[PDB]
Each structure stands twice: as structure tokens, then as C-alpha cells.
Design a binder for these strands. Structure first.
Length: 278
RNA sequence: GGUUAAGCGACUAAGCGUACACGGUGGAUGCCCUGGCAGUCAGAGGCGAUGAAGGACGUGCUAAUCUGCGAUAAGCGUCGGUAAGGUGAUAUGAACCGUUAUAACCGGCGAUUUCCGAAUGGGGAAACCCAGUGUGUUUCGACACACUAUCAUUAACUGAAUCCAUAGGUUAAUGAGGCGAACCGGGGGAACUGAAACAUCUAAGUACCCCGAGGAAACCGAGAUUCCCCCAGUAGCGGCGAGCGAACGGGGAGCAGCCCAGAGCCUGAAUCAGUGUGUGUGUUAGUGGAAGCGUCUGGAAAGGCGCGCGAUACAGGGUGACAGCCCCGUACACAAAAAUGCACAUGCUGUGAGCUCGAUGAGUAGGGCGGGACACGUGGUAUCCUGUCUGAAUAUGGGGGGACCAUCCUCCAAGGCUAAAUACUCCUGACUGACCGAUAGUGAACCAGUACCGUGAGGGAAAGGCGAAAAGAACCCCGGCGAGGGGAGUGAAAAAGAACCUGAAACCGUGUACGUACAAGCAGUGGGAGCACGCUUAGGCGUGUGACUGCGUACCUUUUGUAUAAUGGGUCAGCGACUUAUAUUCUGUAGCAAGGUUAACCGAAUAGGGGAGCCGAAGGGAAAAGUUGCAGGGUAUAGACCCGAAACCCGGUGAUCUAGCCAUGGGCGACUUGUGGCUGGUCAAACCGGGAGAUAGCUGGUUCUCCCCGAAAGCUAUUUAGGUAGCGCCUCGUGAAUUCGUUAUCACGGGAGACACACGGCGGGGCUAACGUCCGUCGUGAAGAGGGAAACAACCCAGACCGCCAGCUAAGGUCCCAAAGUCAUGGUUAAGUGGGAAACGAGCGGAAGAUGUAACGGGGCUAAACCAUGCACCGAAGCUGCGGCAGCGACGCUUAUGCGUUGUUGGGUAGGGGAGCGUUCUGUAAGCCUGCGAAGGUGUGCUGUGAGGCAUGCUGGAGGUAUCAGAAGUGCGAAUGCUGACAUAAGUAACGAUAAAGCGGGUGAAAAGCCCGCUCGCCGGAAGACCAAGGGUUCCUGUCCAACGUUAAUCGGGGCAGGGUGAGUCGACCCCUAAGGCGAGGCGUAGUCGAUGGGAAACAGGUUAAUAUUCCUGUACUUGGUGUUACUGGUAACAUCAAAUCGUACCCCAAACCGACACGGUGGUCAGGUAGAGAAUACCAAGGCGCUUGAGAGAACUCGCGAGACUCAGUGAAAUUGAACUCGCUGUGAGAUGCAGUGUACCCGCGGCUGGCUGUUCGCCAUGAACGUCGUGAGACAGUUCGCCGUGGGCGCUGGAGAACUGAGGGGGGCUGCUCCUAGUACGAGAGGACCGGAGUGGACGCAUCACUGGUGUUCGGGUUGUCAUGCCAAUGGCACUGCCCGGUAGCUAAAUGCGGAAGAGAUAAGUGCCACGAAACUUGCCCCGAGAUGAGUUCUCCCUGACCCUUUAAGGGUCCUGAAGGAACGUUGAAGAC
């Protein structure tokens, strides 16, 4: 089948779409010898020979991990001011990369998923799937049980009547409380904009459970967890795509707990690494 | 001798790993095969309206299949050869026939030779249904036989528009509308590979397909034709790119050259053919046919020894082991009732010669008007075909002689024919081979054009190793009247017993010996100790096992690196990606010496004979004295080192199913059903076969072994780009001069690959401002062993051929780990300096920073460090010594290597050069070996520097091999390779589209679940039954339990046997009619056909073990013929006779059928009784029957004491993973489970591994700049936050068991607040105001809490609508969630009462004095835990008298006898309470 030229050089370990167009316009990488034109499409077949600016790159398994993004980081790559991001701890791949799913702010933590294919990263964001996820809200201010039922109905926000679904109580008698709000529409930052109407200011938003992936009880900040085969096959057939039978994860169920402990050690290590990069 | 203490020290494995012997699942290899591919010497190329090829049933004395056969049904008549046997085979028995000439089998000549398929009477579904017309007939009611869909030709007869002719119809005869290969011809017609680019071109008048025919097709000469052998990869043609592509002569004759235009004198002539008979010679079925007697070994003789016959015949195979002569086949000698072919007697019909007299081919050529095909668009344009309208000549016109004009001869237009060889191999017989032997060869060696799958078509698996002869287990024992196994018997052999000759690797077990429960994470070899079965007249000699130590960052592919969180393979066995054919060029080998070579054809078939070509023989000279094959080594081209491409084109399936529109027939209003027509940008040009075993140069992959040697990094010229000329140094061969003591240098020939650089010292280059960028060889971090810096291939050191318990260096170093001065002489001796860097100030503090120490690889080090000088040891595979300096290359002594020495020595991909084996087939080789035991497989030993070969033993019992050569499907570790046989994951997960289990009895060796019986409630106008499809014996009965079924399954929906379902009034066939079709002429009429309505009848009951409305019995109605009566052939009454075929059960609303879990779709018919307006609701009635399987316990969540989930008998999985004896942290190199160093482990499990936190946006505590969608730079979509720490069984701590203590190390016992008195205070002239110590009152539950004060509370006070119990009611109790619950005692749970963490004492940092003080983290000591703490203690009561032999006489073991204290035990036990 025929595909776009800017898409083949996207997941191969180069750039995205606008960055690839800035390279083919100067006369660097070319297909079949002649200089290709922007906006065309060719048939990708395992047999072509191209050189990325005079460098032979062999371009021909999907891996999805769960990184949790603490405070003081960015979900992008380049930054005009030079703030640290999240693409500084991902391992290197041979002819592959990682594609983030979603977008968060600085004061909004969450468990992001980094996939390899660009098609699956655009299905979970579309409202056609509607996946329910769990969040942990740590309120701090004047809040009672009378305002918990008013925000569950139609409340005017600024663009659309944003509301919640189910609000429970799981302890919280000291200085803060636990208002586990369940959401399923997605959007981008739809919890802080609803609690600022009262004394609540939303100090930190931490994501707990996403869809049906079991959260490992004992995972500190600064570190990614690669999902096994039994976990990546759930979100694959959830949309349209058939499940893949080829992977890399075997058993290592005790080797995996070794992972847990040594990795808590190495998250301490990566905090040290961020300090050093400072 | 007895007791006590200390050190060393036999004995605990339910497992895992290793070796020998003994089995099984699995059936490889060797060997064996009436079956093939491919050629030659004779032949054959058929069958085709008296019924084909390919294909269901029926047929034997018999239950069935294939071949064959057709109620005259593997048999019969006539005519021939052998008569001591047969009724085909798989595959035996039972039943018959033949014996002084009626058996069977083979060949020839006749009769006979279904429905259906080209099928002709009309439809049609290849085996469903009806025959139309005309005779005879012991059967006016029954059968058989014969003739007729067409077109064309000949003859006879008849006949319209339209007087003649012509169309149509009838009869007879001849001819044939059939199917499956190769090759040839005619009419049409493709894609892909390399094309510098492009509709130029090659591939390619091709593959495939249609019709028809044939047996094969179509300036020196000379006028049947074609093919093969030559001229010839030629003379020509093309952007003269790759390609395509002729003739004469000659070398070879396996050719044979006819008839008509013919009058006349003369015919059954000469040369020949067709149709009969007779003789002679052949082909196609048969018979006779010579030649080994015996003995030893062995159960058995085809081979051995001695003596012979035979040999025109030993071509091959079978006959108990390897066969001339024991059989079946070959020389020689004979037969003709039928048919056919090649020379010859006679006969009938025959297109017909010689001599004489004549002739040598008119609608043609050329020209004019209007088109197309010949490469050429109507060109400068030749040649080929010429409709309609026209039109010449016969040396006064035309062509040819290797084509200007001219001359002479031949030729100058419509005729009719021409064999064999050569092409082609689907069928028969004989013969042949350096082809193969069940993953080979063909899809297929047997029941392979198979089981199975799909709507049809296309395409498409596995499976014999039966034995010489079936001698294929009588009887007895166990068990279930089985399966399986053990004895006996038979046989040479029984681990070959219906998986059946020999039985490997891998996987899975038993017995013996060794190691492991304190061991170091893909650890193997070596060194060393202990122990066992055979060293052995002391000899730790060898193998397996082998605690502990030392050395070493596994292996392959892919790479600038592979020790990597970057990627690939589960293993074993079998199989697997030829360097061939056809040109040219180059090299090596060998025969006449100035004839080196022939191909095809021919030949006593490789020699002889034959020179028309290719390669050469006139050099010197710019120009005007050797070659052909085979083999080996390269390039290009039919596929050519290419596993599955994708896309496009061509040849057979494209309105069938779903969803619509116009015209609708019936049954009861946008209903439903059946048929037909119209509409192809997903059934809208899917798949398979042919092209095509095509094609993407890279990606995966150039495969077994072996000796020597061996090109590159960021580059140069510099265009036009993933490329053309070209690279010093280096290789093989040749040439080779002191050129730069075996050619290191120059030239020539052959083979024809890569390309991001980075750091440090010295020397150079933007503001040496940036520790960057830009340059050179060996050389630490990435195509060079090992050693050293803790480890390795971008500065250190070294050219590593092989053996050993040898000695001596350099770099790095010398305290221990771990072999290397605890050295000597001068300095240094309190900043953890020795364990980084800049600038500023005067060898110190030295951004002097958390590499388990408040920054060396480890423990340390206050000099045990560093610099300089002098003196030792240790230091690889270098130098040296010994042995062949194994192997290769020279000189000096030597003509086919016995050298006395020295030097280069295993870095490497691609490529190139010299010396290589094993296995299989043939000549060598009918020889030799060959039952005192072959080959292969399976062990050990010996030999060899190469892959190996030779011998012997066990198993096995039938044909095998070496030397001198040559020809290939040729040595296997991976391509997710393909086939077959097998693990871990795991004896675990799972028990599902949801009515409910349990109790009793009977059968059986075994009954949780199957069968049978009783009561209430889940199913129940449908989870029911009866019709129409699909299926065509799944429904009844009996026996059996291997396979089939999600467990069991004595049941059954499984197999076998028995048992097929009564039809003129059960359903309607045939025929007629409507819509919709077909319809000879013409381009829909006349007809032929086509129904769920109209079309004679029966509504009901009884009788089955299984299926009925039918037979028996009772009653009713109608349509023909015949006989009688009545009325005038028809009608009525009575009686008698006849009336075909097909379908038929179970299933039919989800079980028996179609998607594996009714993870749904599913036409149509019947709405009973009571109540109600109706089809809701009410009596959930009757009938069919009541999830496909159990027992305890009964969280959170969910549904309403129950129903699920989790843990358990039995049965019973997949994905992933190269393989396991699954150890942290720091550090190194782009996030280390596996290397090195330190701390810590008996095996199998479960629970821990950013709310414990923050008084309110900020701080603390570490268990239009992006990331993705697609889009022909066209922009939108939506979318952007902008093993360790702990807890349980079975064990151990020195034979063993039940307690109480001492308590190493860590989280835990050291965490918080207010008031009053001391105290308007110490110090101070005032104000503000102490510190320490003591008491009391608050948070958090530190263990709690029952006298009193609360709450909760399924066995007791105490009620209540209805119902139930005590006989009924009341008075008392219990059930529908604990029906709503109203109160309380004891045990448990708590917001209140008592006690209780800030101590007493000792030791620190910071801070404060001149030893004295010293905090919430540390320590005897105030809660609590703890001896798996391997370093492992003491006391204390106890527990603790059975013996005889063998032997190497000792920490020993076995048999007979015995079973203690304590612990362990689960039918005699639930106020103990989720588990």
C-alpha cells in the first residue's frame, strides 16, 4: 500500500511532520534518487534504499510503557527557556521512538502512556472510545457536603457545561481530604477549573488508575514501567486494531519484583540525575 | 578402667546433576520393491446413431467393494493347440464339477449386448416423472420389437402467391453435431526482466482460447516443391543502443517426377488400382526342446573340497542363504477353421498406349474514380490484394541471366495430382541404464484423481519395510463371560506375538556408586582431598563422580561497537536454495615435426571413409612458419547464487443471497409469500490455473572441513548522481639492472569492495576566546592473543606455529586478598595530604565536591605514600635451553628431498593461487571376502600436525569392500525455513449466551452423575406439538464400551445384529386457463406450454413393542365398459369386473440440522373453559416434562438466612521463553537480575517493596516554539494545558525428644500542650522577665475497661394483621432480609474512672567553664521479639540392658526377635463463633 513520505520518517527515529518537511525542502533525503516533492505519497516496500543526508539508515514490535510525570517537567521536547521535560529518561530504540498520549501542564501530574505507533495514539484521544480513568484530588479549603451535589449537574464553566460523574470519600480528617473524582470524557485539565469557584484551590492532581491497567502498589515519582504482554493487548483491540502476538516480555515475575525494588533505588538515582543535569 | 572439659572428626536428601548396565514412546539409516522419468532397433495414431470415453446399482454355493459382465447379466454355441486340474484379486472356510476324454484359463469366427450421459417423442436434476403412431398375437381389458428434433447432396413423386420456374411437405439410400495429448496451418490477440530518459524496439505473429482438416502439416550454370546437414551469429537494415534476420555454388541422394485440352488408322494393349478364390513367403494366440548323482559343518544348502556333463543356449528376475544344469524362459524341428500386408496363374467391370498429321493456356496486363491491410502518418515510394462502372496484343507486348538502355535461347495469365524418411509418445509386446529406492520418484508403488474443505469450478495430505513356510497360542491361572500381561506348546531365532526383519538421537523411568542442605549467580578443561566395582605377590597408573582454590566481562547473525532493557533461533531426526546447456576469450596437459582440425549424414552404428566452413601457415613494413576437443578458472544471455512480492494484462465463473423500481396471481391495507424483467463507482470485473519455479541489485541467505598469503574510515579529480576515469602501501605468475645478503623498488596480466570519526602530549591553522572545529604510522576508551591500569581491539607493552613441574626482561608494580623490599640512605611525622581542575590573597586553607570508609579496585595505611640517587626478588605465549625448531621457502656438500644450521611463523571480511577426503554408480572386478558370524547402528582402545581410515566386543542374521580414474540431486547450527516425533510454562488456570439440588428402590465386581417410583413450587397461547426444507435409517428392540461426546458415562444421539413406513376415496400427478416466458416466417400473430383457486370421494372410533385417516367391522357419495328391466344411443333402478407411478418415519424454532460455549439469524397455520371492552391482568389449567456434573466453609462488592466468586476428589490447556544451581547496594559502559570486589541464603508458598506528609497559590520529608492524524505542498478534520525484611509443616545444631534462661544486630521503650505554688523572683539603681526540681488537669488507645455508667447482639424475658405449633380460640412461641425489632446479664467490641513514654546512672557533637556540664537519632538499663546467630553455651529433672553369624575384624551392614519416655494420630467434640 501507498503511504505518506513524512509519516515513514516520523516513527523511524527522526522528527514528526513539520520537522521532516523542513529537511526535504533543502534537498537532503530523496526517494528513488530524484528529489521528491512535498505533498506526495509512495508505496513503502521492504527494498528501498535511501540515505538520510548521506547516511544509510535501515528503516523497516510495539511497546507501551507507563511513566508518571511529577512537578516541574514538560510534556514536550524543545523549550525556548530550557525547562526540563519528560523525554530525558526514555531508553534508546533501534529505528523507533516513543509517542506520548495526552498533554498535561506543569502543576498537573499524571501517568502518561508512551506508545510507538502514531495511529493508536490518536484513538484514545478521540471521544469515540470514552475511557474512564481514576484521579486523586487533595482539596484544601472550605468544602462541605452541600456543594458536592451541585457540581455534579449542569454548571456553566467558560466554554461548556463541565461536570463530574461520581464523587466518593476515602478518608481525610487531618489538613486535607480525599475526593476521588471519576472522569471519562478526557479533555485537558477539567478538575481545577471547577473547584476554584469556592475555597478549594487544587494544590496537586495525581492520577491513580487509567482504564483497567492495574497500578503497581509501590511506584514513586521519576520512572517508567513497561507494560507486559497481558496489559498491552487490552488497549489494542479496544478500538479497531487486532492484537499483536509478537512481544518481548516473558515471565520474570520474581525478576519483576527485583525490578520494583532496584528501580525505586534508581528513581532515587534519577532524582540524583536531574540534580546533576541542573 | 569410670566421670568432666576443650580441638579435630563416621552417620539425616521426599529432589537435581554425571557415568555403566537394563526398558518404553518415537522408526531414522543401511538393505530390499510386478510401480516411473528419459532414448535406440520393429510397429501402432484407434473408437465416433446396430449406441463412445469418463461413470451409480444388479450378477458367484456366500454379507460387501474395485476390475469385468447387461435377466442369454466374468457364463453359453461353433471351430483349433495342452487335458491328471479349477469356480479373478483383496481373503480363508462352508458348497460343486473332472478320472480310458462335454473342466477351468488363452486366441479366432456368431447370436445376444438396461434407465440415463452427444440422446432426436416432449420436458429435464448425468441414475426424478409420462412414451406418440402403425401390424401380428390361444389374452378387443396386458407386453416385447421396429420408424419419426435438423442442415446439406443424388433420384423418384406431389404442390401456392403467379400461365412456366422457385419455396414448403412425404418415401428410400449414402455421409456425420462426440471427448482427451504433442506437433503443424488458417482467422483474432497481452503483461513483467536490462530499456541514460520516452506510445521507437527486443522479449513476442508468443503463452492461452475458437472452427475445420490431416495421421505429419504448409555476366561462369540450371525453371516440381518442402525439411535436415552448409554458405552464416554472414553480405544488409536501426537515435547504425542492446536485438531481430537471406540466397547461389559445394561437402552428404535415406527423391521415383505424372495426367488433360487427342480428331483420324487402331481398344477389352503396355504400365497399375479396386473387389473374390487357390498356392508360397510373414505378423497376431501355443506345444516338444539336451545339460550336477553323493558326502563334512548347520534345523534347513544356491556357496567350499575331489571327480564330470553341458556350452548356436551364462539376457534378467523368482523357486527355505549368493542357482547354467532342482523349476519357469533360450538353439534346432512342426501346424492354418477366421482376418490383414509386400512380388507372381486365370476371370467380370476398368479414367487409358506406340507410329503419322497439329497446338503449348483471353474478361487478363496497363490506365481512370472511391477505401483498408503490407513499419511508413497518402511520402522522394517499390511490391502484394482490386467491389461497382469500362477495356488490348502473341517476337510490333512482359519477367529472369547475381537488376541503366541493346542482342540470341527458354519462359509469357482460367487445369488436375505427387509416397517414404524427417514432426509427434496418452495405450501394447520385447529390449536398454556410471537414474532412483517410501520427506526420493509422478498428487498418487495397496481401495490416489483419496479422506476432508468450498455454492460450483480451480487448487490440494499421511499411510507396505507381513514370515522361508501363517507353524497367527489347545489346556490351565488372575480379572470385568473384556482390554492388557505372565506360563506352556510350536519354530533356527519370541524384549519379531495382528505398532508383527534390523530399532538411532532427543524426551520420560528403575537399581548401584559419587557429590550437594554456608553456597557465589549461561564454571568447561587443569591442580588437590575423600570414597566405590576389576590395578596388584608393597608400585596414590587411567576413567566417571569429585567439597574447597586460582585464571576468564558466554556463543552466533546483524554492526561505526554486541560484556549491553537493541535484535534473532525450542531441540533432535529426515530434507533443503545445481555453476549446467549454448558463443567468445585466457591458462594447463598430450600426437606428426614444416597435411595441425573435420561437423551432420553414411558405416560389419565410437575405428576406417569424407576437408564445403570456423581457428592458422608473407614476416619485416603505418600502409602498399601451428591448431581442434575433454577438464579447470571468469563475464553476458533461455530463471542462472533469488525464499511469499505488490500492481497490471489474457483465457472459463459477474443481479445467485441482502437491500429497490414498473406490470402482481392467491390466502387472511405502506402486511406477508412465489416467479420474471430493468439499474455495475465492493458480489461495482473476488480466488485458482496458464504467462509465472517471472520479477524489487538492498533487507534474510553466497552452507562441510583444511594449509600459506591477504586492498579501506573523515579520501582524490571534481561533474550530472548514491556514480564515470581513477589510489600510494599489499597478493599470485612473469620480467628484473647495487634501482630504492632469498627483489623491501618499477612495469605488465588475472580477480573487482567501504566510507558520521573522537581524545591526550609535542609540532601548525576564529578573538589557539569554547576542555570545540581542521592534519600522520604502530599504539589504553571502538580488521590484533595474552599480561598491566579492577575488565576489553582510536596515547601503555608485545609479531601469539606445537609440547613441559626450566631460567632470564620491559611497561605497569612489590601490606593482605594474591607469587613480588614491612628495603637501605637523606627529607616528610597530625590538612584523611597521598583518593581532579581555574582565578584572587599570603610548599598550606588548596567551587578541593558522599565511587559501602563525612569520593584508591577490596580490608587498610598518620608513611605501609610521593620525587631524586644506589643495591635485589617476582614479571606472558618475547630472548634462551630440550624434542620432529611437525609444516613451507634458500646457500654450502647432492641427478628421481637420510640434510649438520639460521631466518620469516595462527590479526582479518570480500577476492585470488598450490597440496584435500569420506559416501554413492560404472570399467578395473562373473575376480577377492563371504553362518567359527558381513555392512550399518551402538561402546572402548590404537594410529594420523589436515576432514579420517583400520581392529575387536554387545545387539542384529544377509550379500560386502580397498588400490590406479571419472561423472554429481554431493559433508549442515539458525533464512518466523518445510515434514514427522517431543519439554518448561502446569497436573495449574478453566467447570460459560443460566429453574433446584437432595432422599428411596432395582441391576452390576465397582452407582457422586445415568435408568424406575411418590408430594408442592421454578418451564408452560409457548424453551409445546403437527406440515413445508436440509439430511436419507440419527427414530423402535437386543448385545457390546476401544474410537465418536468439554468429566464420569454398565445409559445413549457410538459400532454390530434383528426390524425397510399398508393407500382409486393420505397429499396432486397428466391435461386446460390468467399474469409473467417460450414461440417456425417477419425484425410479437397463428400455436406449442405453464397453478397453494375453480377440478367425481370419508367426517369419526377401535386395533402397535416402533410408523397410520388405509386391512377387519359399521355407514355414505361419484365416474367408464359388459348383462337384465323400464322410458324414448341418452336417463333411472339392481348386480358383476377393472383402475398406474412418485412422495410417506424420526428432526420441523433450536438437542439429532448450519457458526466449537442456543459468545444471534430463523417462513406459515390453530388466540380452549371461567372472568373481562380487547390478544393485558385473574384459576400461571391440561399435556409435553422438570440447567450438559458434587461435597464443607458462606468476606469486600453486586443481586434478592439463599443464589455467585475464592480454597478442595476425579478428568483436564494455550500464549511467552536459547538453555539454568532466578542473590542486594556502590561503581563502569546511555536506567546492569547474569562480569569483577564487599554484606547476606535449606527446598516449595502468602502478605510489604506521595498522604505516613505540609494550617490557607509559595516551602520541607525520598516507601505560533512541540508530541501524534492524513492530505499530490490543497489544506481541514479532533487537538493540543501553549533473594532481602517478617509470618507456617516436614529437618538440623554431632544417635533422639518435651521446657525454663543468659540476649549479639535493626525498626521498635526516649516524639506533644496549658494553669497554680515556689516567684512581681537569681543578676540589677528600675521596668519586662527566669532556669532546674515537685504535684494536678488535656490529645493519641501504651496494656485496658463488666462494681457502676452506653451501644451492638441469628439458641432466653416480651408481643402482634392473617396463617402454622400446644386438639381449636384466648393466654404463650416460630417463618416470608434480623417480618418492623422493644429491653437486659456473662464473654468480645468502647467517647467516661486508675496506672503510665518528658526517667536514675554512664559515655559524645554543637554551645557554655577552670576535671566539671551536655540534646527527640547510638549503648548494660524502662514495653516487647529473637539460637538457620552454622561463632551455634550452661544447669536441670528424666529419657537409654535383645542376640547369633558372615568378612578386608571396623565409628560397618543384613536376617530372626523387639517397637520405650516424648512428639506425631481425627467415627466417640462446638456456649470455643467470617475462613
Amino acid at each position: 500500500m501507498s503511504e505518506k513520505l513524512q509519516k515513514v520518517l516520523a516513527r523511524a527515529g527522526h522528527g514528526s511532520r513539520r520537522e521532516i518537511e523542513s529537511i526535504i525542502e533543502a534537498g537532503r533525503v530523496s526517494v528513488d534518487g530524484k528529489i521528491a516533492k512535498l505533498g506526495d505519497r509512495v508505496e513503502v516496500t521492504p527494498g528501498l534504499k535511501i540515505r538520510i543526508d548521506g547516511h544509510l539508515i535501515s528503516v523497516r514490535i510495539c511497546r507501551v510503557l507507563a511513566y508518571y510525570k511529577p512537578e516541574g517537567e514538560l510534556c514536550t521536547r524543545n523549550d525556548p527557556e530550557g525547562r526540563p521535560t519528560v523525554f530525558d529518561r526514555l531508553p534508546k530504540l533501534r529505528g523507533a521512538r516513543w509517542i506520548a498520549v495526552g498533554r498535561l501542564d506543569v502543576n498537573t501530574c499524571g501517568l502518561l502512556l508512551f506508545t510507538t505507533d502514531g495511529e493508536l495514539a490518536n484513538r484514545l484521544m478521540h471521544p469515540s472510545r470514552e475511557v474512564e480513568r481514576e484521579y486523586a484530588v487533595r482539596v484544601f479549603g472550605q468544602v462541605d457536603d452541600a456543594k458536592l451535589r451541585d457540581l455534579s449537574r449542569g454548571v456553566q464553566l467558560e466554554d461548556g457545561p463541565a461536570a463530574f460523574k461520581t464523587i466518593k470519600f476515602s478518608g481525610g480528617e487531618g489538613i486535607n481530604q480525599w475526593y476521588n473524582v471519576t472522569l471519562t470524557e478526557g479533555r485537558n485539565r477539567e478538575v481545577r477549573r471547577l473547584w476554584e469557584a469556592v475555597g478549594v484551590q487544587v494544590s496537586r492532581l495525581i492520577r491513580v488508575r487509567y482504564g483497567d491497567i492495574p497500578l503497581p502498589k509501590g511506584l514513586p515519582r521519576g520512572g517508567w514501567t513497561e507494560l507486559d504482554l497481558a496489559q498491552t493487548n487490552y488497549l489494542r483491540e479496544l478500538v479497531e486494531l487486532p492484537p499483536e502476538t509478537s512481544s518481548k516480555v516473558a515471565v520474570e515475575k520474581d525478576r519483576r519484583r527485583m525490578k520494583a525494588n532496584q528501580i525505586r533505588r534508581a528513581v532515587k538515582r534519577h532524582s540524583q540525575v536531574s540534580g546533576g543535569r541542573r
